[PDB]
Amino acid sequence: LRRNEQNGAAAHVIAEDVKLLQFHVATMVDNELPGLPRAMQKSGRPLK
Amino acid sequence: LDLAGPLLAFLFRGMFKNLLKEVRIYAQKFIDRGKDFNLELAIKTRIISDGLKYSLATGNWGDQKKAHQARAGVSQVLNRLTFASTLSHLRRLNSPIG
Amino acid sequence: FIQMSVQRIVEDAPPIPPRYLLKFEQIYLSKPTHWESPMMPNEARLRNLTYSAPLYVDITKTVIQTQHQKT
DNA sequence: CCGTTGTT
DNA sequence: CAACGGGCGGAACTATGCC
RNA sequence: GGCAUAGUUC
C-alpha cells in the first residue's frame, strides 16, 4: 500500500488494499466475526 | 444403514468427477494449441488413490480441503484386545446425533 | 460395491473445426499387487504398505474411432 | 434459551 | 415484533494421521 | 515439536 500510494494508483486499487489490510488486522485481533472470509494459511486450518 | 458399499460408492463418485474435471481441463488446454492430444498424460491416478487412502486413513469422510463439514468417526482402527472385542467392533452401528 | 456400484458410477458420468470426444466403456480389477507381484496381507501389515488393487477402464477417443484398453 | 439493538 | 450473539463438567489414560 | 480425530477409565 505504501508503494501504491507513492507511485500513484487507479483510485480503486487503494480502496481494495485498504479493505484487505483492514480484514487482515481484524482477523489478527479476532478470527470469528460473523460473515467474514475466515482467513486460513495451509491445509484449510483456520488461524488462532 | 450406510455400510462399506454405500460409503465407498459415495466417496468414489466425487473422485471420479474430479478426475473427469482434470482430464477435461488438460484436454482443453492442450487442444487450444491445436497440436495434438494424449490420454495417459491426461489422467491423474493420484487423485483416486490418495483420496481413497486418505479418507480411509483419517476417518474424515470427504475431501481433504473440506475436512471441516466432513463427518469424522467413520473408519476407526480395529480393536485387537480380545477376539470378542474384534467381533463387536466389526459389527457396530452409529447414530450421527451430536 | 465392487461388482456394481463402480461400474454404474463410471457409466453414468457424462462423456466429455476439429472435435474430440471420449466415452468410458467398462472397468477391470486385478487381484492386489505390489509395484517396486502379489502382496499378501501379512506382508502389507509388516511393511506398512496398503492392500489395494488397480482399477482399469476402457476409454475410446474419437475425432470429428480409436479405442484405448486397460487405462 | 434468553439478554441487546433495530425496525416499526 | 424481529434479528443477532453468547452460553452450555470435571479429571485422567492410550492410539493414529498430518503439517 | 504442535494441531486434529478416535477409543477407554472414574
B75-80 long-range contacts (CB < 8 A, ≥24 apart) are none
∠ CA(B33), CA(B37), CA(B43), 5° rounding?
Answer: 120
Q: What grid cell was written down for B98?
A: 451430536
Using CA atoms, how far apart are residues C46 and A5, in angstroms rounded to an integer? 62
How far from each other are the two terminal CA atoms of chain C, in whole angstroms? Answer: 20
Q: What is the resolution of this structure in A?
A: 4.3
Using CA atoms, how far apart are residues C64 and B73, in angstroms rounded to an integer? 49
Q: What share of chain A is helix, strand, coil (3-state, %, to 5)?
A: 50, 5, 50
Per the CB < 8 A criterion, the answer to whether A44 and B68 are in contact is yes
CB contact under 8 A, B16 and C1: no
CB-based contacts of B66, cutoff 8 Å, min separation 6: A44
Q: Is B58 exposed, middle or buried (0-12, 13-18, 19+ CB in 10 A)?
A: middle
C21 has which bridge partners? Answer: C62
Nearest to B70 by CA among B7, B17, B4: B7
Per the CB < 8 A criterion, the answer to whether B37 and B31 are in contact is yes
Cell 456394481 appears where? C4
Helix (H, G, I), strand (E, B) or coil at C61: strand
Experimental method: cryo-EM
Round and report the angstrom distance from CA (C48) to C1' (F5): 21
Using CA atoms, how far apart are residues C57 and B16, in angstroms rounded to an integer? 12
Q: Which residues of B touch A44 (CB under 8 A)?
A: 64-68
